[PDB]
């Protein structure tokens with residue numbers, strides 16, 4: 001049975017919150033966060049991986065203009081690795097795809113998608129695999145200015161996916177079930193960079209519509 005609560009921050013599987021800056025590279029940050037968890041699970045080391053490597057190199061995505069996490073996991077697998085943040089730092093604008101003869105920090109062997117709209121399957125994946133990359137509708141002012149509590153807004157549109165984040169756990173606060181979400185808008189956004197989003201409230205904000213995790 002998947003546990004009632006899981007918080008990967010408490011287990012040391014989650015790196016510090018980053019800021020994507022003036023670039024719409026959320027998909028890159030969501031992707032490396034998931035790879036960071038699997039690297040930790042597999043090797044015992046927690047390390048910042050490189051979202052810039054993905055922005056500059058995943059030709060199938062649109063750089064600072066948006067992209068898909070699956071395309072990023074596919075690139076890491078075909079390219080035989082992703083560099084660390086230290087070897088390929090984030091600059092927040094698209095540039096040429098650079099090759100670092102010794103930058104390789106993690107590999108990926110593929111990915112799996114969570115069945116569309118199934119929060120129970122998402123819960124199980126988080127519990128057994130670790131942090132999972134998810135997409136949501138982040139267009140509401142109530143989301144943008146979130147500060148605390150379990151977020152739920154009836155206006156959220158589960159078919160309007162416009163932002164990529166990372167699910168690092170789930171739980172319940174004052175009787176309300178939630179997902180623990182790591183964002184990439186810096187530590188000053190939300191609650192130290194995180195937001196608790198309603199869980200089992202009918203796929204609120206489309207949280208379970210485009211979820212995936214990398215195989216390592």
Ligand SMILES: *C(#N)C1=NC2=C(N=[C]N2[C]2[C][C][C][C]2)C([N]C2=[C][C]=[C][C]=C2O[C][C][C]N2[C][C]N([C])[C][C]2)=N1
Nearest residue numbers: 024025026027062064065066067068135161162163164
């Ligand atoms: C993040 N950050 C992020 N930024 C986005 C996204 N769509 C547009 N933007 C920017 C807003 C200012 C201009 C660019 C997304 N979208 C997103 C989130 C999660 C999963 C998928 C996804 O969209 C992937 C396709 C994006 N696509 C690019 C090409 N245009 C023509 C249509 C939209 N995230």
